[PDB]
Design a protein around this ligand. Sequence first.
Ligand SMILES: Nc1ncnc2c1ncn2[C@@H]1O[C@H](COP(=O)(O)OP(=O)(O)NP(=O)(O)O)[C@@H](O)[C@H]1O
Ligand SMILES: Nc1ncnc2c1ncn2[C@@H]1O[C@H](COP(=O)(O)OP(=O)(O)NP(=O)(O)O)[C@@H](O)[C@H]1O
Ligand SMILES: [Zn+2]
Ligand SMILES: [Zn+2]
Ligand SMILES: [Zn+2]
Ligand SMILES: [Zn+2]
Lengths: 676, 676
Amino acid sequence: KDYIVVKGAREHNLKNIDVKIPRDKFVVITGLSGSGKSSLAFDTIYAEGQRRYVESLKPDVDYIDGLSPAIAIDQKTTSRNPRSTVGTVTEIYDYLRLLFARIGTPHEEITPRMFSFNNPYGACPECTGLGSLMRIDPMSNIPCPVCKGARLKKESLAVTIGGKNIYEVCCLSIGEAKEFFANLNLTERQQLIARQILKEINARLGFLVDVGLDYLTLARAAGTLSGGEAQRIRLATQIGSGLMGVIYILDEPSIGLHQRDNDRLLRSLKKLRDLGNTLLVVEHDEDTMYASDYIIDLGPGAGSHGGQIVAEGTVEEIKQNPNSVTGEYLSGRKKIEVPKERRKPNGKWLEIIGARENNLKNINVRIPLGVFTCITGVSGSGKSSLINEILYKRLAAELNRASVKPGEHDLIKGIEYLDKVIDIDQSPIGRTPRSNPATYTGVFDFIREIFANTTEAKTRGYKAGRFSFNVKGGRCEACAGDGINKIEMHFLPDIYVPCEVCKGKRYNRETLEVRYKGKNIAEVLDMTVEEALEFFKNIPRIHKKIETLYDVGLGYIKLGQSSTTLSGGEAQRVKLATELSRKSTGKTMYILDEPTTGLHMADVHRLVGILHRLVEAGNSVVVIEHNLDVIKTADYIIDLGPEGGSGGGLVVAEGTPEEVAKVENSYTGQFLKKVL
Amino acid sequence: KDYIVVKGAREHNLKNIDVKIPRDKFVVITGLSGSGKSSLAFDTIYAEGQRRYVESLKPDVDYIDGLSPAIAIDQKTTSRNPRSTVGTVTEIYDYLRLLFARIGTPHEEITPRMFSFNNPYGACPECTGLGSLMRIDPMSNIPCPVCKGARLKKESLAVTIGGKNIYEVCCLSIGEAKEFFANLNLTERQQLIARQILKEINARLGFLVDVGLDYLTLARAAGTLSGGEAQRIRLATQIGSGLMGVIYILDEPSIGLHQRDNDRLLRSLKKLRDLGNTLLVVEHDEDTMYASDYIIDLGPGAGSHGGQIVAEGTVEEIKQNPNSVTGEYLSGRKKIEVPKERRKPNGKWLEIIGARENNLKNINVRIPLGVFTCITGVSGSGKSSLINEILYKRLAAELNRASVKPGEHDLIKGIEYLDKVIDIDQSPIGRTPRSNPATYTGVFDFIREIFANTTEAKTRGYKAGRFSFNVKGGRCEACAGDGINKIEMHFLPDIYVPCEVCKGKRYNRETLEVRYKGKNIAEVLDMTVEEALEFFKNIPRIHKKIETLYDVGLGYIKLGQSSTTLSGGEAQRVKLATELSRKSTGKTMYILDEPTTGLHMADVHRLVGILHRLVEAGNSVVVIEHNLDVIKTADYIIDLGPEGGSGGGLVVAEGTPEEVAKVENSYTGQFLKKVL
DNA sequence: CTGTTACGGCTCGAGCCGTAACAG
DNA sequence: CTGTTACGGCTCGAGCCGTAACAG
Ligand SMILES: Nc1ncnc2c1ncn2[C@@H]1O[C@H](COP(=O)(O)OP(=O)(O)NP(=O)(O)O)[C@@H](O)[C@H]1O
Ligand SMILES: Nc1ncnc2c1ncn2[C@@H]1O[C@H](COP(=O)(O)OP(=O)(O)NP(=O)(O)O)[C@@H](O)[C@H]1O
Ligand SMILES: [Zn+2]
Ligand SMILES: [Zn+2]
Ligand SMILES: [Zn+2]
Ligand SMILES: [Zn+2]
């Protein structure tokens, strides 16, 4: 029917909830980090919709009614193939080659297959159409000397329209290519025989421009792209294809996108929906809520304290609902307050000389030390390059002795003012089931000593290393401390089940005999942080670490959770807590690349508090954030622009946000003037 | 929108046609064999719909608007896996195990995973849940001695409901299982806690019964199934899943199904469509046309003479259209006439003694010789087993000395009355690009001699083998007579393009110099049969073979077409022409397994004429046909029934169709009484 | 001339945890 | 007591075409 009825969903931490999502409408799922929105969407609806279609050619839900095939558009990147480019992915190269073979004037007969690099007819004989000959320097990729990177035969390059061949057309940026195709002149016969192709090309280019990627080049390889750029390219391609009756699931479509493009992105999403589809956008932006037809709010907390549908309905009912977390922040009951007094530089600056990496226009920038510094700018302005490829790499090479090649820069002044450089990202903190937050924070070494300092341990002569599931002697011998066994089937992939010897306790019978304060090591490792905070009140050495973990918002997690199952936000919060627990020497540099990726308003407030605490501790924090709430609390803002692509790479404004708001020709300043 | 607009389609032999298929409606595509309906549907619409969805996770059309994801349900069978059974495919085993774990009374706590054979918890330790231990006899599959084929642990078999465990329930036929579940009694608590599961099981069993497979057992392996049974199982599963907004493409759903189940199949198709889908059924049945909302007719002929949309609209407009081929047969302008005089047996009979293979109830049947004999019966009555597994195999072993194990039968009387056995099926006649209809019919040897009989060939001393693309000396040396070359790409599968040396002519420069009647060998091999009929009028030796090929309806095909690209109908017609060209000795046996699979009414009439010619030639033809038009023209009908499955396997009626129509308790007789 | 049989030949090392030692 | 550094250890052969020879 016209509803996606889900009854009896218990995936992950869902508390047996029932929902009725309307069909063919814009639906936004909102909740705190780890509340369960991501599980409820991806693991249930996307999984069921994909399985029910692939099986034609296993969620813990009871039954779902009215499920169309589901396509997931998330921030995922793959190496792909060298044959794939931006134009190939967007399916505009086919129309380009059709137009070239139809109305192309040469400078056998011209054929559409003659312009393709995926067929032997038009592919360059030397590089086989790849465009680059990868040779291992006595594998460094070098341009093909024959085709000069065009990846086509020399004969096919004679066909030109408007004075430009196919490679020159494909090398232009999307916006200027659309402008060139718009004002092109053709006779009556050419217009009659190439109306459909021109209309399709114009429509696809307009969709790509409206999405936000008006600076990309069609000749750029699809492999070398960011997550946001790839996701936006996929959204534009899906709009162009025009599939009907398909449920689309989006994970934070506004990630890595400036505030000025939000209206265009919302219009693009509405246009995609209007052709007979449904959207399940999982977004936390304030502007996105007001453009939706149905909001589903989970909570009220996270982990074991959430998973229930707190509120449902339109934005007005969400605001009027008192127990909804999202409505409290939307209505203005709780909000982030702009600081009254801002820190000032002490006279120590980091100046980068001759930064010309990628599209940077050989500029010099000064970064204050000891203050919270934010970097803004339009999409594709070169801020990410300028930070990651130059400053972080040079600092790592100078301090940590890391052998990573920096970008195209001359030198940097002020290296002696820092002692170490630390990068915090959503990368997982572990790849094996042998690490948990308890060991990463370092509190496990204290808990082991506390356990070994008991009367029974001294009586039995147990050492500090006995109570650890990583050495021989204390762990379970049957499962080798992993807690699971390997069972192989005849025609099925190997399955993993809990070990029968220890029942998943990870320790042998002898170890479990000891008990401190009525609990053994398994009970300690199988309790949440909010309980270990009260349990370890007497001991301050572990109390400090537990309180630090609780401060970053990890009061719902348990010390025994494997690092493999941790999400990006959990890993980032664990790293932040670990850095908080350390001893600040006043010479530490923290670099964060958009830390607000997938955080609610309350999580943003907590992260702002933690960042201010870290700055006040005596160190310096530099972040690249597009969120105005984080931006307005900064102490020094560097703006890059004034546009994206070849037009950008310069510096528009610098200084405190109050000074930046006074700059007329700056989008960030214009937005800051209104928000303040 | 609400239309699938296709503009500029030129796949295979389509003559650049434009169509506008309505959406969310029952659409039937009708045309002659080889007209282009199959191409237009599968190669264009299914391919585009599948690609546009797979690429998210290349037809010769210009653009298609409004394409939902497409699922194709056709008669294809795969080995699959031993883990897959009928219940697993139909997704009823999950509900069965849920019910057993919920309300099961035993004779850790009971768990749904305990009843599954795909998890180590409930899988039998010996056979690993497969159910059969395949060992190579000094690989014969024998039942597992531990679980006795149940493929489960002995502990889980104690759980019983209604006096039967899970294996006994899964071993019942679908109809009797539905009856058992319908009259089962349970208390108020059991009904309250298992209402949804029971409702789902009853609905799925009812769907399976309505489809037509009320005799299958849930424990039967999905691998050992026929094409029609697998297609019907897939249709029932797709109905059960309940996908919305998906285009469904069906290829003759009424293949291998009795006339009495047509109403149930049509109701099932309408029920599948009514939940918000679209159907593209490609059917030729007369009853199916009257149940359609839109009929698209191709033609007017086949091959190069077809590919254009002759007529469109409802059944009334199709009938009123004069140039439409389908309307002429629907309105009654052209029809098959029942013969007035029928041939009678001459006193030679083939008696099968002790036929007990599969569900045959140890019966004896007499087959007349020298007359056209048809075999009828309900679906799954054992006719196909009785013919293929017993009679054909025994005849092949006795005459062709083929070492194939026959079925469970005692002996056969009348083997000496036959000299050879010939089986005609839709199997391809060749697997390599070295065989074409010209060589298979045998006319190529005559054409080679005709070419070598010319003055120039004698002058140059060319032999008969010079003009053949299969030996060294006459063929092109560069491409070795294949006509295509192999080109390898760096990161792409090898592609094939026409050879540059010979331009696909398959012969060297010297051979092409010779010419007979103004045409060389390439021109002879690149002309249709309808042209070679007039070209070779003078020579009777090749004229007979060409006329024989033309008679079976292959006047649109060319002698140079590779056997790899031939479809099933083309291969069957080629085999029929080859058998016609031979010399009849009066002791030949022809066995056909539903030869009307994918044939129009005109094709059915032509096939009936060819079969009558073959019978009048002095041989005997035995076919297993479900088409009443073919049945009413037979001379001896053997009916098997009176039901399908364990209830069938007997003989209901025998003799001429007039006598069979007098039998009251026979479905075939009841239908023959009305049709005559 | 026509059918049959047999033969010949062709293709299909990296990252993290735990521990010992040293220095503040 | 706390931080750092170094080290040890663990896991991720069949089927078809062409031809020579023989018999009707
Ligand atoms: N490998 C590359 N080859 C060529 N051009 C590149 C490459 N990497 C980046 N660029 C370009 O150089 C600039 C880099 O900008 P960058 O700082 O990565 O973007 P950004 O501002 O962080 N945008 P966003 O991802 O939306 O947050 C852009 O104009 C890119 O198109
Ligand atoms: N391998 C097998 N194992 C067990 N039972 C089988 C097997 N093959 C067939 N059967 C059963 O034995 C009977 C065979 O009937 P069969 O003659 O194959 O069907 P049919 O009349 O041709 N039906 P259809 O496919 O609709 O045309 C049916 O009852 C089958 O369920
Ligand atoms: Zn090249
Ligand atoms: Zn164990
Ligand atoms: Zn067994
Ligand atoms: Zn060649």
